[PDB]
Amino acid sequence: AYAKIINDWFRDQNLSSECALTLDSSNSQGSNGSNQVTDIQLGGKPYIANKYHDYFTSCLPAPQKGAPTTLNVGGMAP
Amino acid sequence: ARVHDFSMFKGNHIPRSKIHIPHKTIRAFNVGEIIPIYQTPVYPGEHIKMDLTSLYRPSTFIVPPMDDLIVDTYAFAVPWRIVWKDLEKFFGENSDSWDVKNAPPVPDIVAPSGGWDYGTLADHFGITPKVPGIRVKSLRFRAYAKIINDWFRDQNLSSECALTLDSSNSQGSNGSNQVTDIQLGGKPYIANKYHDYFTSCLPAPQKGAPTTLNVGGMAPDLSNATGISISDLRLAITYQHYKEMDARGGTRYVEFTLNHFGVHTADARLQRSEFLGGHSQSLLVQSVPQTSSTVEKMTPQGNLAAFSETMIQNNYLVNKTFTEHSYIIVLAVVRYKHTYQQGIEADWFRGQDKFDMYDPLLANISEQPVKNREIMVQGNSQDNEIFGFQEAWADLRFKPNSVAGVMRSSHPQSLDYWHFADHYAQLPKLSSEWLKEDYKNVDRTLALKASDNTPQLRVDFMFNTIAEKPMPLYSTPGLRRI
Amino acid sequence: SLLVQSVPQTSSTVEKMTPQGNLAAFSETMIQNNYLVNKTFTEHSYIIVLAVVRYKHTYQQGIEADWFRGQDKFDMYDPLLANISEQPVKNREIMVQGNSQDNEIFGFQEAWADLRFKPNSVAGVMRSSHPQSLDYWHFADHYAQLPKLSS
Amino acid sequence: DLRLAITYQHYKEMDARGGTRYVEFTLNHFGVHTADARLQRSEFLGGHSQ
Amino acid sequence: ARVHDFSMFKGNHIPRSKIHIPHKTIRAFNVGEIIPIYQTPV
Amino acid sequence: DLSNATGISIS
Amino acid sequence: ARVHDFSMFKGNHIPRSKIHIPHKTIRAFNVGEIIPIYQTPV
Amino acid sequence: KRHQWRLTHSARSIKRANIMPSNPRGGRRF
Amino acid sequence: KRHQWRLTHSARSIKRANIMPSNPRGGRRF
């Protein structure tokens, strides 16, 4: 449930992947690790909040989310 | 006191318009089949307003029947998300960072060999039958099965229709299997017959194993052996109360919450298809006298036949707004109330001693068995064996509908073409197959039988929808922004 | 529109015949046109009055375009793709043959028009291709070959 | 082909600004608030900042 | 016009009460850590 | 036949 | 009673404005001649 | 009081109704 | 409410109308 709340609210979806969340009925193995992805559901070190939105914290990886859109160029010659 | 924290751009401005969409479809099918008569995609934010007009023409009757046919029509909303697990990945929700790389396409279903047959689910969804080699997106076939599982299935006598949530393609089927073939577009699902005395029976007095008090088998005259505590007795009694509550009310999680905690939980929270609206109406039967002269070996002048013509109006069948990608499915089924000619009512067997007779003190005892002799009496050892279970003393609250005399089916010269009453070749068992509606009882009353491959019903459906959609009034090429 | 009066069968059921209670129909309609022409004429001319009888159409051999969407998210409607160019109506929508002609173009319609329209249809024994067919109940089209958009 | 390309760029830019979670997709593309419980997200109850 | 169609028993009667539950916990942690300070089954 | 040659972005 | 029959898109919106156009021309001719002194496309 | 239509076929009459989700004996089924 | 004429053949009704010149998609045709 803790990891679920991080994924729904606290994760930044642009710079990181989501915490591992298992939905199955199998048992799990606890962890002391500080890994912010795999160890959250295992009860390890707490998740670290992202710093508040400002000029630099609001930057994005690319001008769009996807590949940049271009107009086609054919390379054929007789 | 105030600083700059990022906020929403409010986004673009989304166009909106109202659209009148008329639709007309003509169908033919039999009694008991649950037939999709409508489907539409719904994009987020649409408000749908739907009226339906139906015209039912059953096959002509030999005589005007002393029985009724009833139409039920149903509307549902199925989100694409509860049918397919990759819907969010499809619109770009990523487990990893930034954009999604490989998003699977919407899954396909492939036609059977030679195509789908006539009268299958694919046929009424609007897939053209007998056209091999075609493939189609499968999410609406999945949506159909989902509605059966959430609403129309009897959870006690049958398993649920197979429903795949994955992105893999599927292979269409012409089969009549009521479990595996529903999502494959095969023969339609057959509705269960209405609740009555016999259709309401259950497999056991509780849902679970019967609760007992412990008995040890140890021997060294036997030393020790202990006993049972009042505390172990209280546990056992609560376990029996628990399983009996589960039997009465149903064990679906939407049903569990209402029976155990007294709480209504929303269907959309629980990922169930949403019920929109529905209507129920019987059909009209117009009797026709015979004005031709009496001819030898014919019916006499004055004989009565019948035809049936009924116009049903459904206003506000759907009124609502949609917050996510979804399908609207509208369903229709024709059923009748049942009458029983082969059994004997349970009160004819009471009187072994005074405890067989009703008393207020025996008002709260456990569910009691309904004997086979009540549904079908064979005069053999199976009569006193159990058909199913009903609440205690329920036969004093019910009097099943009956037939007597030449009217009943077993008579060598039988009048049973006047009614729909059941007829059994063997002793019925409480099961999934017996609980389904039966088109053959209506079929012996018809001048042209469905066993001769004449459909029992010919219906004309007219749909009028007002759709307020997030589209421009007319879509004219050229863009506002560059 | 024209009126249709249904007639029950009051003769007895005869073997290899329609049963007592069968419905046939006849059609008898009286239409009144007042003020069909009201005007004055400034030159030599002819008045011609014309009449034509037509019906609305229903389509049993195609599959609606939405059953083919979902290659990727840009097949699905979006408000951003509201003002794009006219899009092709595929042959599979008017008649589906299960061959290469299905994805070829029948004609062009405004973008996303299938979301504004639901063509009238027929299913089951009602449709014409069935060996024992009820299509004498309706006017729906039947095509021997793939229709072309043409005169 | 030019109109298609321009709409693809508008689409991906809208996804970058607003976020691509399905709760976020529905608000940016269709202007619609969809409930968290419908979408199987944990529900926000309350909060304070000081 | 009316016939017997099965319906809900309305079930049992469920008890209900109001309960005041106090709780106190003492914690130590650093800046930036998202720390669960409470949990309950509902 | 000419390889590469890229194109022009919407930007 | 109502069904969908295609109709006009109403087309685009056409701009409109008022324009003052002065014009001056100087001519010389004889009596009886029919002389075009102005022309414009409309 | 006596004369009636060509519409009489049975002693029992059935009334039209709006359908609502309900919880009958043994769970929901329509 | 129930009984009606020998005049019912379809679910859809069509309303009589005066014809006017119009400009549908693709030009005028009647």
Numbering used by the authors:
A (entry chain n): 152 to 229
B (entry chain h): 10 to 229, 292 to 553
C (entry chain i): 353 to 503
D (entry chain n): 303 to 352
E (entry chain n), G (entry chain Q): 10 to 51
F (entry chain S): 292 to 302
H (entry chain h2), I (entry chain i2): 9 to 38
Structure paper excerpt:
Spiroplasma virus 4 (SpV4) is a bacteriophage of the Microviridae, which packages circular ssDNA within non-enveloped T = 1 icosahedral capsids. ORF1 expresses viral protein 1 (VP1), with a molecular weight of ~62 kDa, which is the major capsid protein. Lastly, VP8 encodes for an arginine–lysine-rich polypeptide that is analogous to the J-protein of phiX174 and is important for DNA packaging. A striking feature of the SpV4 capsid is the mushroom-like protrusions at the 3-fold axes, which is common among all members of the subfamily Gokushovirinae.
